[PDB]
Amino acid sequence: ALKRINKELSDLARDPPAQCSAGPVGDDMFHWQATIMGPNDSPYQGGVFFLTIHFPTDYPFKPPKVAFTTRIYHPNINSNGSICLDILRSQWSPALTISKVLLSICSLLCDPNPDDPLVPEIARIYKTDRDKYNRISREWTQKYAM
């Protein structure tokens, strides 16, 4: 894993995603992290988000765990920070450029699709009760975003 993980680091260092910065902590090649800024369109402008990663001891070949330390009231993420990513599913290549994953989350907010996510409660509220959603959206901003 030390070699594989270092594989992405090469493409990451030489040229890391501009849409979002990321990199491993210390020389410990196992824990990865990233950040995302309000695309300047959705109700979260100026809201900085942080998400940690966890690589398996059996090589990426195993679905990696991801969570959201920041409290985002988006109709697609639960409380435990459960992010819905099809990549993890069959669309999980034992050798994928995590760089694409980060972008997937970026486009998610810049293009959501309220349907049957892991948060049907937020879906309904956002569905018609937009006025309220805006209240919590702005309230959850200063709470942890800022």
């Binding site: 890391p16 501009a18 910065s21 992290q33 950040t35 800024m37 300047n40 900085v48 942080f50």
Partner: protein, 76 residues
């Protein structure tokens, strides 16, 4: 020394600063370089915000490093 800075705009350029300088000064140079004001200028690193009253040697960022620049868009 030399240091790389990349913003959301995708803009990337090598800046020049001394290891004894303070984030308070570099902020003055970066803005004059791109033209972006300090209010919108921000410095992030592995999820660590740089303080205005801190020296490069303090954060031990070494040389040939890549700083994550973020734009603080207020709009209100």
């Amino acid at each position: 020394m030399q240091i790389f800075v990349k913003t959301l705009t995708g803009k990337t350029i090598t800046l020049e600063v001394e290891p004894s300088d303070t984030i308070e000064n570099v902020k003055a140079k970066i803005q004059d370089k791109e033209g972006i004001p300090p209010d919108q200028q921000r410095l992030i690193f592995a999820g660590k915000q740089l303080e205005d009253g801190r020296t490069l040697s303090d954060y031990n960022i070494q040389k040939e490093s890549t700083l994550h620049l973020v734009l603080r868009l207020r709009g209100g």
